[model samples]
Target: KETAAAKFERQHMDSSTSAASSSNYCNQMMKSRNLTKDRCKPVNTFVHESLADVQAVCSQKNVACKNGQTNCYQSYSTMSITDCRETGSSKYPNCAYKTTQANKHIIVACEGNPYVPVHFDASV
Candidate 1:
């Protein structure tokens, strides 16, 4: 069984490939990373930073999660990230995505004994 932190890492973290220049980046990654198994994920993000930098976001500033949880935080620094948005015409199993790269502050849900990020909430 995978812990929430581990699952988060598997689903969102991508310390390498900071550029994400290719338009098909998300289309390829979404499937390769296993986010496109049973269904297509509407939106997702890949953070291009070290694990320590990503985890440090938990200590930045407190924020409210989308579900109203108080465990979320926003990063003080803009991070290199790739946004994966599913195209309207995209069908499941043939998930098409628009890959966009930007530097933005991210909001994430943090948890566990060490209080590391477990879920990516959004980017601001």
Candidate 2:
């Protein structure tokens, strides 16, 4: 019998081709992470506007957390995109692209007992 890793390898050998849709990617990632779909929904990871890079828009809006604060919510001042890519894992091969809107916002994974969003702004 093929292991999960083996199966993933056979399915996603070519990173560019057969890349799963963003929605599907989120679903699979949530499943692998043992998280309920409701707990972790796919939020807009990037934004752009006025012919400017999404990153710039988001950076301007990024507020510093309060003293001893762990997480903060960020909003972009423009339009942008959130995309994903394959990281080539045998078991969990296709990691999300995380980079979108001219590399403005990035996808981040969280780890811990309470399960806080791993990346800054809790958007990961």
Candidate 3:
């Protein structure tokens, strides 16, 4: 019974990450974060910013979500981000990833009374 915001946090909210991870950032994080339980998540991203900073995006530059919704917004400032892409050989319980980090503005979908990011849309 998790809210969208909570799921969002579980999936994408990490204030700390670098191109430099302990070993394999995606392999470790993908497993530890519980996204590769049954099947690997093909693609995912983690925004390296605080919860408050991301939440505040709900009030930033508004834009239509990729799916044509009205709850999406673009970040006002560039933020550090990490993209985790599962390698072709990786499969269930042993997901692998290609780590790519950069600074970019993100687009996220938000919902609820507090209006927090619920889904990551894009980076621009």
Candidate 4:
């Protein structure tokens, strides 16, 4: 079993490689990461920076989470990231996605003694 923080990493972390044809990248990664297993994940964002870099955001100034929680933090630096959104014609077991790659500041909500990211809030 994995913690929410670990699940967040599985769904959103991509520190080493980058997409060439980003749409295809999303198509594959979404499945490989198991986000497309049961139902299409409507939207997701993958950060292309080290785990430590992303985790460091937990120490940055606090911000309000999308759900009105106060446990969110915004990164001080921008990072390379891939944004994934399901296509209009997307379906289950064959989830389709569109990718938009860009550099942006990341926001995430964290929790617990380890104090790691539990949810990705948004990109700034």
The top-ranked prediction according to lDDT is 1
- Which residue pairs overlap in candidate 1's backbone? none
Clashing pairs in 4: none
Lowest lDDT 10-mer window, candidate 2? 46-55
Clashes of each: 0, 9, 0, 0
TM-score of each: 0.96, 0.26, 0.93, 0.94
Off by over 4 Å in 3: 18-23
Candidate 3 clash pair list: none
User: Scored by CA lDDT, what does every candidate get?
Assistant: 0.93, 0.33, 0.86, 0.89
Q: Rank the candidates by TM-score, best first.
A: 1, 4, 3, 2
TM-score: model 3 vs. ground truth = 0.93
The TM-score obtained by model 2 is: 0.26
Query: lDDT order of candidates, best first?
Result: 1, 4, 3, 2
Between prediction 2 and prediction 4, the one with superior lDDT is: 4
Q: Please give, for residues 42-120, the per-residue lDDT of candidate 3 as tens digits.
A: 9888888888999999999999898998889999999888889988888676788887788899999989888788999
Model 3: ten consecutive residues of lowest lDDT:
17-26
